[PDB]
């Protein structure tokens, strides 16, 4: 609740969070078979929290499960889909019983008239409805695992304008809340899939805000934004890519309190 802020030490905190951030083994992402299932050579899932694809040949996709015990909120953070990936993306989404998708990074159907099919993973994707607001756009989507012939609906929230290492303060929250209100975050359903370009900077900022906002409800002013992020950064390396972004989560959360 206190501005650092005249001190100007915002980077010093980031350097601490970056430095004191635990690093874990990444054996499986590293494998020559999995060289091209990664978009980014530097960003990779921790071997312990990674999502495993059910398809027997290769169970690897670049996603990591965040579980936050106390807050009760679980997210799945993944790089955006590559050409290869699109099938895997929806595979996981279907495997983890997810009922919400969060794109913050400027693989779905543009027209209702035209369905989408992935031979690779044997899933279909049809648009159902669309909603454009200026800040963010929402689609109502339908997934059928063709083999099952069982259809389960999915909600896609696209934060249209978040710069690659940029923010994000009101629109962010409206958007966060919109996602909350839809019930995609609710624990009845599997994890909400959150994806930035590699699923760290924007993803972290997004998930950071929402979790801490949950803490104030549950707990009062006890919460520390660090400690939570360090803890969060245990499941997926490199969450929050800038000091400006960190400051922003701190900020959003403060504003979100009211």
């Amino acid at each position: 609740f206190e501005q650092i802020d005249k001190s100007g030490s915002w980077a010093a905190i980031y350097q601490d969070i970056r430095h004191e951030a635990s690093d874990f083994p990444c054996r499986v992402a590293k494998l020559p078979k999995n060289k091209n299932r990664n978009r980014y050579r530097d960003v990779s899932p921790f071997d312990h929290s990674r999502i495993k694809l059910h398809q027997e040949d290769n169970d690897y996709i670049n996603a990591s499960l965040i579980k936050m015990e106390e807050a009760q909120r679980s997210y799945i953070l993944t790089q955006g889909p590559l050409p290869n990936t699109c099938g895997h993306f929806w595979e996981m989404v279907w495997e983890q019983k997810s009922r919400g998708v969060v794109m913050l990074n400027r693989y779905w159907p543009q027209k209702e008239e035209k369905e989408m099919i992935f031979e690779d993973t044997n899933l279909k994707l049809t648009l159902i409805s669309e909603d454009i607001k200026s800040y963010y756009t929402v689609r109502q989507l339908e997934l059928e695992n063709l083999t099952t012939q069982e259809t389960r609906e999915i909600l896609h929230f696209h934060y249209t304008t978040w710069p690659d290492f940029g923010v994000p303060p009101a629109s962010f929250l409206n958007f966060l809340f919109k996602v909350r209100e839809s019930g995609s975050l609710s624990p009845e359903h599997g994890p909400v899939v959150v994806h930035s370009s590699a699923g760290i900077g924007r993803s972290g900022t997004f998930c950071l805000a929402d979790t801490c906002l949950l803490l104030m409800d549950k707990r009062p002013s006890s919460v520390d934004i660090k400690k939570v992020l360090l803890e969060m950064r245990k499941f997926r390396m490199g969450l929050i890519q800038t000091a400006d972004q960190l400051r922003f989560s701190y900020l959003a959360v403060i504003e979100g309190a009211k």
Partner: peptide, 6 residues
């Protein structure tokens, strides 16, 4: 194969 980072 690019790096997101910096």
């Amino acid at each position: 194969e690019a790096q997101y980072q910096p």
